[PDB]
């Protein structure tokens, strides 16, 4: 019956919908096309920041390391790195800007620092995520073409990963806390999962947007009473020039939280 209104909401938006929710309080899950692949767009940046924090566990100085990027690293969507060009930015700051403003230059910088795309994939493999695959740099990874497995994951995989990283034992304590802190300071997420949750709840999320009207959001939610909820929602549409449907992500959140 969740099955139904989601099925319903999907046709209505003439899109494809993947949902994975993990209620950590009772072990319950809601899964919808959750083994299907979906272009992750900026949501991978969550995995990317966790990878940096992993590395930082054997590199005390890595997070304060100052990066002096040139003008040519700048992309269209790089508000924060643009702001700090003259002075540069620390690894930490870059992680923040990539999580909280979805800065694409910050992301590309963080991938170099780590040792390239494959380093991100190896990190995912290391925490038991078999589906996450990063194939292209920013900004080419947002093409989100139908049936293209490049730069995709499954809602289940990403939900499992976010659970491990933010609530479980995949990172060491300080790192794990920092990842949570970055997520809770996100500025891009007002109209998606946040919009579907009660305003007294605590939400930490990473959004992702792309071609084919791709509208994504992965979140951990802290309800006023009880243990936290992991919620991942991926949505994509028929035509390449589709307009985003952030409302759909809010609607899905409402549907899901109504069960619980």
Curated annotation (Swiss-Prot):
The keyword Signal applies. The class A beta-lactamase family has a specific amino-acid numbering system, sometimes called Ambler or ABL numbering and often misspelt as Amber. A multiple sequence alignment was used to derive a consensus sequence and then the consensus was numbered taking into account insertions and deletions. This allows use of identical numbers, e.g. for active site residues, despite differences in protein length. UniProt always uses natural numbering of residues, hence there appear to be differences in numbering between this entry and some papers. It comes from the Bacteria. GO terms for biological process: beta-lactam antibiotic catabolic process; response to antibiotic. Its EC number is 3.5.2.6. Belongs to the class-A beta-lactamase family. GO terms for molecular function: beta-lactamase activity. The keyword Signal applies. Substrate binds at residues 206-208. Keywords: Antibiotic resistance, Hydrolase, Signal. It is an enzyme of class 3 (hydrolase). This is Beta-lactamase. The active site is at residue 42. Transmembrane segments: none annotated. It catalyses: a beta-lactam + H2O = a substituted beta-amino acid. Pfam families: Beta-lactamase2. InterPro entries: Beta-lactam/transpept-like, Beta-lactam_cat, Beta-lactam_class-A, Beta-lactam_class-A_AS.
